[PDB]
Amino acid sequence: IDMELVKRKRIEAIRGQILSKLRLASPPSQGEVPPGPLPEAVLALYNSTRDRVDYYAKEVTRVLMVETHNEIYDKFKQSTHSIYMFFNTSELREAVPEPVLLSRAELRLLRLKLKVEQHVELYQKYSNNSWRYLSNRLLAPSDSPEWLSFDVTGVVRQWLSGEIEGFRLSAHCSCDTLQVDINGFTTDLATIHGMNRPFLLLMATPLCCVRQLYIDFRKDLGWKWIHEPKGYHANFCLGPCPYLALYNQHNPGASAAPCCVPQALEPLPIVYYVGRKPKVEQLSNMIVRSCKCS
Amino acid sequence: IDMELVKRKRIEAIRGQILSKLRLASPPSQGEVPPGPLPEAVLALYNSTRDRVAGDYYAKEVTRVLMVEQSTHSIYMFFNTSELREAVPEPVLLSRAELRLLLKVEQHVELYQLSNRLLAPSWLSFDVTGVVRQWLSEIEGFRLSAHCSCDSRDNTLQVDINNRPFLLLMATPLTNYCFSSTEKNCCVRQLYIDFRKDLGWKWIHEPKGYHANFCLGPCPPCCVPQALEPLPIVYYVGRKPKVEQLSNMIVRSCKCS
């Protein structure tokens, strides 16, 4: 078994994978491109999507949240227990024209010096008044600035159809004749101000099969010892994985040698008797629901 | 290919798949089986595992522990760690532990001792494995409060608020990397791709290349990617630089399926 031959086939599959993922038939031109280094807005965007926090390639764009001295803070005021992050939807629509195009939207915050557990919640601004809890995070202390990332795809999709819309990141509240715990009485929560202020990172579209097989324990295996279930849908994977560019169903991982294999499995709980006490055991990965070439 | 021949072979493979998952050489002797129907306590426990609600190779044993004796603003659930120590006998055997429970308008709940969930109008399940791990180390309980928002307007702060429970547990009973040139297992192997050197490609401006890697090795069944990572790239169309993200480009680990 020659790993050097596998590398050869892996490499040629890479060539096809990248072109097909970009829905190109052949690599594009250049020379209309000037020489030297990329613009820093491009590098910032590219760096943003490499920061750590469907088949076809997504265009990546970035829209930074409106600067904090505009009408932010004309009304509700930034703080250390609550931060406010507003976005010009016309700029969002500039980066992703129609909402159907959006595939993922991430809200990115650069967290500061932290030295105690802060539990924070993300809220969306609505009508013109109220808020909807979106999600929360439990942040371990750290003396290193780390980026936070929140998935806000559904919200941004709506914005892509108001004109100024915002988020709020606040502190959590314990609720229990009712008692409440407070954080906001000591002394900016996360980075606002500057060109590492919060931004929306946007990904958008631009402008071998599972085969049914039912196993009956008695009928197929002569097995009486399993009292439940009487049978189950094991199913299985079969069909070729060959190699315009389909590539998306035949070799989407660009293996040197794709195989039809289970993509998603799920368990099978059984009831049977060991000695004469009943057991209930969960067997992992017994049922094939989908297959893929990989 | 005859699909019927492969069906014949999957069927005979299920025979050994089930038995080796149970670490059994042959189906257990059933000449001592208590006759007739099976205990409804057992069936209720089977029912609870089979059905799901808002949410390793070898067979894990399944055990359930109900709750002992409040509002519609909070629900307090207690269990004695005695009764749970009888289910999972030693704490390191614990594979997973779920808490089970059973409206007109949205409401938003919280678990303290953790997680929280939003319930839609019309059971329920919470993963509490780590909390139930240490409880097996004497009486502990769970907090299901309601959620509240708080913020600051002037000097003004504001707050707003809008078959018994059961603990289901699974337990065990009482990834390769190659750098060698040796093929003995299925493993991820290193492979660096240089766009210019390997493909003759000058049009990708940022990543000069990347560690694509690949899977390879025998399995007692193919060696395939388990975890992949995306690759972002920068190139120009016309005078326009573009950032694109490509999924499933980098193999980080391999499995056999």
């Epitope: 008695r218 009928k219 | 069927i11």
Partner: antibody
């Protein structure tokens, strides 16, 4: 396509022995378990015997156990049945049958045309 | 092995529907899949139902298989009877204690003419 042609049926003095053949075309005969089934004039089908595709494993009905022997040879894609100490009871049309996944699951997917053996004097 | 008992014969008029029963003598009918073969005189048999209720391609939906656990039997049902359905029908199952294949005695179906 998928076909099973049998030969060697005939008339045999009672205590003697024939060997039926069943040549197979249209499929990888090597991979398949194979069966023999028989039918006495006017009476039902009667499963006779089976072999694994390798040789190896053989099972028989009680009615023929000590007497009949199955064999196959994959190099000729041909299944055989050495019958021993024939009787008028064994007078029947003999079919070779290929199972559908397994006889116990989906029965027999294909049959030969049959050869008649009549055991008389 | 166990026994599968079918009626010696059934008959019905053309267009009508008829059922052929296949009773198992011992052990639960649900222990094993039941198969149904059609055999025309002179022909070798062919499948009309397998795995209790599945039709091979080209077998019309007038042929259906079913199982009555309450009476430990399998039933072949043929609707819209046509002259061509006249044949002998065999059920077939498996035992697991004899590792053997068991056939019913067969039923002659007459389409009344």
């Amino acid at each position: 396509q998928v076909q099973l042609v049998e030969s060697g049926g005939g008339v045999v003095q009672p205590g003697r022995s024939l060997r039926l053949s069943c040549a197979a075309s249209g499929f990888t005969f090597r991979s398949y378990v194979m069966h023999w089934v028989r039918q006495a004039p006017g009476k039902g089908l009667e499963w006779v015997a089976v072999i694994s595709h390798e040789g190896s494993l053989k099972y028989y009905a009680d009615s023929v156990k000590g007497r009949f022997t199955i064999s196959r040879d994959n190099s000729k894609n041909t299944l055989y049945l050495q019958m021993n100490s024939l009787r008028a009871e064994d007078t029947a049309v003999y079919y070779c049958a290929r199972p559908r996944i397994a006889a116990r699951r989906g029965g027999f997917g294909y049959w030969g045309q049959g050869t008649l053996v009549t055991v008389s004097s | 092995n166990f026994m599968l008992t079918q009626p010696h014969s059934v008959s019905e008029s053309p267009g009508k529907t008829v059922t052929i029963s296949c009773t198992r003598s011992s052990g639960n009918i649900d222990n094993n899949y039941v198969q149904w073969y059609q055999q025309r005189p002179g022909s070798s048999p062919t499948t009309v139902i397998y795995e209790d209720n599945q039709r091979p391609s080209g077998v019309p939906d007038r042929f259906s298989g079913s199982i009555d656990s309450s009476s430990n039997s399998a039933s072949l049902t043929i609707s819209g009877l046509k002259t061509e359905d006249e044949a002998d029908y065999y059920c077939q199952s498996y035992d697991y204690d004899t590792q053997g294949v068991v056939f019913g005695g067969g039923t002659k179906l007459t389409v009344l003419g």
